[PDB]
Amino acid sequence: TKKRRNNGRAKKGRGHVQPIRCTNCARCVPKDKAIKKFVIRNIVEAAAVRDISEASVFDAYVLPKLYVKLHYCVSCAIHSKVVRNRSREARKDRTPPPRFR
Amino acid sequence: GAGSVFRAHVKHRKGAARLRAVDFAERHGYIKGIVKDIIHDPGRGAPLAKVVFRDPYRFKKRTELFIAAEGIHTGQFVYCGKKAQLNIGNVLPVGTMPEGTIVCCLEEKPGDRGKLARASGNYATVISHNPETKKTRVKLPSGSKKVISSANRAVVGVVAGGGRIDKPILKAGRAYHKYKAKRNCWPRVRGVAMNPVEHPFGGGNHQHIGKPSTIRRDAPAGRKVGLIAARRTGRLRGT
Amino acid sequence: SLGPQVAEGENVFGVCHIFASFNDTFVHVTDLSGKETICRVTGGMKVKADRDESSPYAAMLAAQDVAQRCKELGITALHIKLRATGGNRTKTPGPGAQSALRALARSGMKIGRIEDVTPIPSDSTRRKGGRRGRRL
Amino acid sequence: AKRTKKVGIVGKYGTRYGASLRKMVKKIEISQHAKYTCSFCGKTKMKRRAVGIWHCGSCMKTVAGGAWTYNTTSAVTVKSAIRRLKELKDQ
Amino acid sequence: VVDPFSKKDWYDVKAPAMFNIRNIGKTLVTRTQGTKIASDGLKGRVFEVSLADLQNDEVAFRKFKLITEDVQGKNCLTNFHGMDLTRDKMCSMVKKWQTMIEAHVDVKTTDGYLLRLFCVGFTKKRNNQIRKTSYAQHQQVRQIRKKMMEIMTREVQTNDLKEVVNKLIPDSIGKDIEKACQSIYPLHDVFVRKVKMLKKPKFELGKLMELHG
RNA sequence: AAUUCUUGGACCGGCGCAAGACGGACCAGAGCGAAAGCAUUUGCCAAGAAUGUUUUCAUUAAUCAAGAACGAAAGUCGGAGGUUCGAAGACGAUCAGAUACCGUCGUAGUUCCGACCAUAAACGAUGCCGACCGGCGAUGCGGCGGCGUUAUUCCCAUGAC
């Protein structure tokens, strides 16, 4: 019985791919199959973007962002609800969710 | 083994094996000599090699006995001293030669005629350098690395007769003839296979030891027998 | 402990290596170079309960007591070099990063240059944990 | 007519010494007694004479190789490591 | 029966004439006691200081290093050790859909000072390009990686260590690649992205005092 | 929580040195290989598919019992090497009991050079060569036609869009 066409992983010119360690667990997962995310983030998020600006040195300054690249196994994804299960046509939508605010 | 019936068997053996001296040539510039035969010696399953240097104060032809480095052949030229070219079977001091190169028949004291690395299949690699002090580091065969005196030399390559531990000696005779061209040492009788008065370990009903076979470094003779000063014991795993 | 400086226009700079893993809080003030050390204190010195030594309150109880002992020698300004556990384990910073840094913005100190200084590899020795995960 | 189904020169030992030493002797007691091409003249008559000491019986030239073969294996790249430290220094 | 911040006296630190501001900061060490001197140990620090604070108003992302090789007495003079760019700034640069082009070298200056220099470049994507990717073919790429190398050595080989530290304050070498690669493939975000010292020539004390004079 | 390390200076901070692994981000429903498979910079050595051709041979081809070359990971036989991890084992927690999850150590093994072994959901669970039967939006390699920006300025043609 078949459910997905492309079977959990982007790979059609290869046969074998390289493994990557799940950053919540430490499980090996095939590069392509993984759930990836990218995080860009000031060292001040919302509360601490206020205390430092009035007791700081430089006249007009900018603080640095913090850049991470995450990698999830399937059940690591699902537990932490970065992703859901989905209905059968719905499934299809590789159209990512809308990021307006 | 302290004398009489044991002392090494020296008659069919072909020379003592050294470097040159040193002199003004080796010391301010360079000299050249030719190879005249590679040549087998007993008590030593590796080959020697005669080398006619020409004496530089009388008309003559001196003739030496180095430890032959693999890849040498006859007729070939050997150029040596403090300047001479770093290629194979060409001698010059550790002071000069670079890091990475392999050496044989290496010296320890400046001028002593080579005491290290002349048995079959042994090197003495150069690691590092410090030219105030005039000192040098040299990794020897046992893992360790001697601080050495920077004017003390070694022929280049790896020692001839390489790979002799390989082949199983099979027959007991092949031992005898190996150990009949060295010293009275072979068919070796165990210590538990001696009476009370002939070895401390053997005696009684069974053929056991009794006492632990480690012993103090600070024993006397007659006793310091077994595993001496033994840092550990058993099947060696890990490293 | 009395540094000679111009009284009305010079703050003595420094640097603090803010270590922030999930199981402990650390703060560590040093010189410009980093070599010596002047005022070090953990979350373990302050709070006493294995599970809540690295908690945001166990990260703020340490940072006030830095600035108590950091205002008696008489230092005002400091550079910053934050961390996160790193190496071949998590590079997202822990819960003693902002509650350790924002605490000294209220406790009589100035803030200067900030960045990350996690260890990160180009690539790595095999990581602790199996092929099959750390089941739970 | 083929005379032995797996025992090379080591028919000369029969049942003696046990299986895995007779296998271990086969790989050394075939290479030692072979001939090799003398690089100098070109012919096919290098040949051993004692432990690690070899002789062309045409142009009378004599070499120091390995005990049981004519090059030792990292003396093949000891020559290609000394040749390459002649590159580092001369400039 | 002791207070450990009495046995510590406040000395000063300096920077060379090639950078703008002279006074960096201060550093503390123990007295002549037992058998150790306060000017023997104080002779090999690293101050990973930026450029903005070292100058009036610069791009701050470049950093520098300044080791103590000499000690004056209430003043620690300094000597070259390295460059680097800021973590944050470099992480921002690397993006999906574009090639990246690294390349390195070990040159020497005329004076002893030996040096390893890294580099980096990223293919730009233009204004009216609909094409997503902006990728560059192998043989396109290795003619950049030979130009990157050709340009680094030329501008160090021939002149001394004092003149290749005044080519890294903006980034002389940087934009001079950008210009000479255009007609192979156009790339934009060019840098030296680390500069690292491998060896030094023996200490002569008057050599350091024409850098402070 | 505890086994485990610590005033015998452990952890965090520095400047040095040393080895044994692995090649981050760039990395894509992109690429090459007969399958297994293959990602640090240069130098060299034999190979390859595609496209291009008003070059040459002239049916020389397709499929294949027997027989042959290659064949992840584990597993073997002898060296070289031993950082990390880690079957067997020793403890600490867990539970009614756990010789299972987790936690502290750790051998065989993990890595090279030599020769065995011949199987995996060795997968697209989908024989190879041949003809034919719809519409579009991307993409990689090669060749051809065509407005206009940009680079080498001085434009010839080569790169970039």
Curated annotation (Swiss-Prot), chain B:
PANTHER family: LARGE RIBOSOMAL SUBUNIT PROTEIN UL2 (PTHR13691:SF16), RIBOSOMAL PROTEIN L2 (PTHR13691)
Gene name, Swiss-Prot/TrEMBL: RPL8
Entry keyword annotation includes Transmembrane: no
InterPro entries named in the record: NA-bd_OB-fold, Rib_uL2_dom2, Ribosomal_uL2, Ribosomal_uL2_arc_euk, Ribosomal_uL2_C, Ribosomal_uL2_CS, Ribosomal_uL2_dom3, Ribosomal_uL2_RNA-bd_dom
Domain of life: Eukaryota
Function description: Component of the large ribosomal subunit. The ribosome is a large ribonucleoprotein complex responsible for the synthesis of proteins in the cell.
Post-translational modification remark: Hydroxylated on His-206 by RIOX1. The modification is impaired by hypoxia.
UniProt-recorded name of the protein: Large ribosomal subunit protein uL2
Organism expressing this protein natively: Oryctolagus cuniculus (Rabbit)
Bilayer-crossing regions: none
Curated annotation (Swiss-Prot), chain C:
Protein name listed in UniProt: Small ribosomal subunit protein uS11
Family the UniProt entry places it in: Belongs to the universal ribosomal protein uS11 family.
Annotated function: Component of the small ribosomal subunit. The ribosome is a large ribonucleoprotein complex responsible for the synthesis of proteins in the cell. Part of the small subunit (SSU) processome, first precursor of the small eukaryotic ribosomal subunit. During the assembly of the SSU processome in the nucleolus, many ribosome biogenesis factors, an RNA chaperone and ribosomal proteins associate with the nascent pre-rRNA and work in concert to generate RNA folding, modifications, rearrangements and cleavage as well as targeted degradation of pre-ribosomal RNA by the RNA exosome.
Chief place where the protein resides: cytoplasm
Classification via InterPro entries: Ribosomal_uS11, Ribosomal_uS11_CS, Ribosomal_uS11_sf
Record's subcellular location: Cytoplasm; Nucleus, Nucleolus
Ranges in coiled-coil conformation: none
Ribonucleoprotein is among the record's keywords: yes
Biological process, per Gene Ontology: translation
UniProtKB/Swiss-Prot annotation, chain D:
Keywords: Cytoplasm, Metal-binding, Ribonucleoprotein, Ribosomal protein, Zinc, Zinc-finger
Binding annotation for Zn(2+): C38, C41, C56, C59
Principal subcellular localization: cytoplasm
Stored InterPro entries: Ribosomal_eL37/eL43, Ribosomal_eL43, Ribosomal_zn-bd
Intracellular or extracellular location(s): Cytoplasm
UniProt cross-references to Gene3D superfamilies, sorted A to Z: 2.20.25.30
Zinc finger intervals, C4-type: 38-59
Biological processes per GO annotation: translation
Gene Ontology terms, MF aspect: large ribosomal subunit rRNA binding; structural constituent of ribosome; zinc ion binding
Protein name as it appears in the record: Large ribosomal subunit protein eL43
Upper classification of the organism: Eukaryota, Metazoa, Chordata, Craniata, Vertebrata
Swiss-Prot record, chain E:
Residues recorded as bearing ADP-ribosyltyrosine in the entry: Y135
GO molecular function: structural constituent of ribosome
Keyword terms, alphabetized: Acetylation, ADP-ribosylation, Cytoplasm, Differentiation, Isopeptide bond, Nucleus, Phosphoprotein, Ribonucleoprotein, Ribosomal protein, Ubl conjugation
Main location: cytoplasm
Post-translational modifications: ADP-ribosylated at Tyr-135 by PARP1 in presence of HPF1.
Annotated positions of the N6-acetyllysine modification: K14, K36
Biological processes annotated in GO: cell differentiation; translation
Superkingdom per UniProt: Eukaryota
Subcellular location: Cytoplasm; Nucleus; Nucleus, Nucleolus
GO cellular component, one term: cytosolic small ribosomal subunit
Cross-link Glycyl lysine isopeptide (Lys-Gly) (interchain with G-Cter in SUMO2): residue positions: K14
Subunit structure: Component of the small ribosomal subunit. Mature ribosomes consist of a small (40S) and a large (60S) subunit. The 40S subunit contains about 33 different proteins and 1 molecule of RNA (18S). The 60S subunit contains about 49 different proteins and 3 molecules of RNA (28S, 5.8S and 5S). Identified in a IGF2BP1-dependent mRNP granule complex containing untranslated mRNAs. Binds with high affinity to IPO4. Interacts with DDIT3. Part of the small subunit (SSU) processome, composed of more than 70 proteins and the RNA chaperone small nucleolar RNA (snoRNA) U3.
Family label: Belongs to the eukaryotic ribosomal protein eS1 family.
Name by which UniProt lists this protein: Small ribosomal subunit protein eS1
Encoding gene per record: RPS3A
Covered residues, full protein: 21 to 233 of 264
